[PDB]
Design a binder for this molecule. Structure first.
Ligand code: HEM
Ligand SMILES: O=C([C@@H](c1ccc(Cl)cc1)c1cccnc1)N1CCN(c2ccc(C(F)(F)F)cc2)CC1
Length: 449
């Protein structure tokens, strides 16, 4: 407009749109976009301009520019004490970038050969421990939460580390470290100034020492040559920066935390929703097609099995992520002016792009609330559940590898029944959204012949 996108009327100032938003971000966001008559628009939040990019045709405008034009650092300040100053965003873009590459090289399909069997074993344990009986009632959001942390550690943690730490203890440190997070923290740069840092630094420093000790070990076993291991930790130790330096224990600790928090809720939600959708009677044909896919697999899967021969199960997981994205907003700080469609975005704005809003556009996704694994985006790029462009998730392959394997293992040895009429409602209260906890009670039936 030789100017900014349309602005949205504030009835009660100094809050902005903070209240109807928190209740239902989706109901709210859709209202504006229609009423504004524009898929792109600014909202006020605490006197802070927030322009949401909600016309799928424009995602490229959001995801393509460099960090110097659209900076992620600022919206993500709420992460530094969980990762450490100078790690991830706190770290400067050259080194932040460097760091992500390290982690990236650890999560590549190269290192995934032992992963598919490692996952099968660790899921199969859990089932025998908690799904003991012929029939029972468990909470799926909680059981997934535990299977996810279990198999990931089984994958990315070395035997020595997993001995002197277990999944459950580490998960309890994830909860301890994270819970300092309030969603509405990222929208007042004074609130960086805790009744919770002083449990966060304790859980980190407990962890960072433990890892330090673990490193003492491996070195005084290197000349000994007892074993060969290349886990995420060991991978990061061998890490060398461009300028020949290496990661301090603190950076390394944070990166392992960052990797682990990163995947923790997102994929456990993802696994849950998928399970929820599939177990529903409205969705049997899909479960049926799911079975004609996992039916002539042997009880022990290889990397080939999940990767190249489960294409339909991939669709289910993506549709779950499409329908109910776990990260609703992705955000940047508009350091410089960027043109969006027929608008401009002024230096100083907060530009956001919402997987939640986007996945709901009717052109791109007809019946957006209908779960359809065979659906395909009808605008190209509509789906941004793993983000896009410069910042596409690096955990995508891994997340899918887990979830596909889990569904397959778990639907091979069980049936399921939702103790409800309708699939859970998304709970929009957490910074990472999943299905409502208290609705996820489900009843398993151990398959037999
Ligand atoms: C289904 C599970 C997951 C979902 C839905 C998901 C979603 C996303 C999204 C939306 C972004 C982009 C955020 C942005 O644009 O600012 C992203 C980036 C990322 N995710 Fe994930 N993620 C998942 C799993 C994981 C896992 C398992 C890891 C680690 C192994 C991980 C680590 C990352 C990293 C490092 C980025 C990089 C963003 C950047 O370049 O700064 N995620 N993910
Ligand atoms: O921690 C992450 C990333 C992530 C970035 C870097 C690294 Cl090294 C690891 C993880 C993330 C979290 C979960 C899955 N994938 C990436 N966040 C945390 C901040 N995020 C976020 C989520 C929601 C909101 C809010 F409140 F506006 F809706 C604002 C920010 C989404 C991205």
């Amino acid at each position: 407009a030789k100017k900014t996108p349309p602005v949205y009327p504030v009835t009660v100032p100094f809050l902005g749109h903070i209240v109807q938003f928190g209740k239902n971000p989706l109901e709210f966001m859709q209202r504006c976009k229609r009423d504004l008559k524009s898929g792109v628009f600014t909202i006020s939040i605490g006197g802070q301009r927030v322009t949401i990019v909600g016309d799928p045709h424009e995602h490229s405008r959001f995801f393509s520019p460099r960090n110097e034009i659209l900076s992620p650092r600022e919206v993500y300040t709420i992460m530094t004490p969980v990762f450490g100053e100078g790690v991830a965003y706190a770290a400067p873009y050259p080194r932040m970038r460097e760091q992500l590459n390290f982690l990236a090289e650890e999560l590549t399909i190269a290192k995934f050969q032992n992963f598919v069997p490692a996952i099968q074993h660790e899921v199969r344990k859990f089932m025998a421990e908690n799904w003991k009986e012929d029939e029972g009632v468990i909470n799926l959001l909680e059981d997934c939460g535990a299977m996810i942390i279990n198999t990931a550690c089984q994958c990315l943690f070395g035997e020595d580390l997993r001995k002197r730490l277990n999944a459950r203890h580490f998960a309890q440190l994830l909860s301890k470290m994270e819970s300092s997070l309030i969603p509405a923290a990222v929208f007042m740069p004074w609130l960086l100034r805790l009744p919770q840092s002083a449990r966060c630094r304790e859980a980190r420093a407990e962890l960072q020492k433990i890892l330090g000790e673990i490193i003492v070990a491996r070195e005084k076993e290197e000349a000994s040559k007892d074993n060969n291991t290349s886990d995420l930790l060991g991978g990061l130790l061998k890490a060398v920066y461009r300028d020949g330096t290496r990661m301090s224990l603190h950076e390394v600790c944070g990166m392992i935390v960052a990797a682990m928090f990163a995947g923790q809720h997102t994929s456990t939600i993802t696994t849950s929703w998928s399970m929820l959708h599939l177990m529903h009677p409205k969705n049997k044909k899909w479960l049926d097609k799911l079975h004609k896919e996992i039916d002539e697999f042997p009880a022990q899967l290889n990397y080939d099995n999940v990767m190249d021969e489960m294409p339909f199960a991939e669709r289910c997981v993506r549709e779950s992520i499409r329908r109910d994205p776990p990260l609703l907003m992705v955000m940047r700080m508009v350091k410089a002016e960027v043109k969006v469609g027929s608008y401009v975005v002024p230096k100083g704005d907060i530009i956001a792009c919402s997987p939640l809003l986007s996945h709901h556009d009717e052109e791109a996704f007809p019946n957006p609330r209908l779960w359809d694994p065979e659906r395909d985006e009808k605008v190209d790029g509509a789906f941004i559940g793993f983000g896009a462009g410069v910042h596409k998730c690096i955990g995508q392959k891994f997340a899918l590898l887990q979830v596909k394997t889990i569904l397959a293992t778990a639907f091979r040895e069980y049936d399921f029944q939702l103790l409800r009429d309708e699939v859970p409602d998304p709970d929009y209260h957490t910074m990472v959204v999943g299905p409502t906890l208290n609705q996820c009670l489900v009843k398993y039936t151990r398959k037999k012949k």
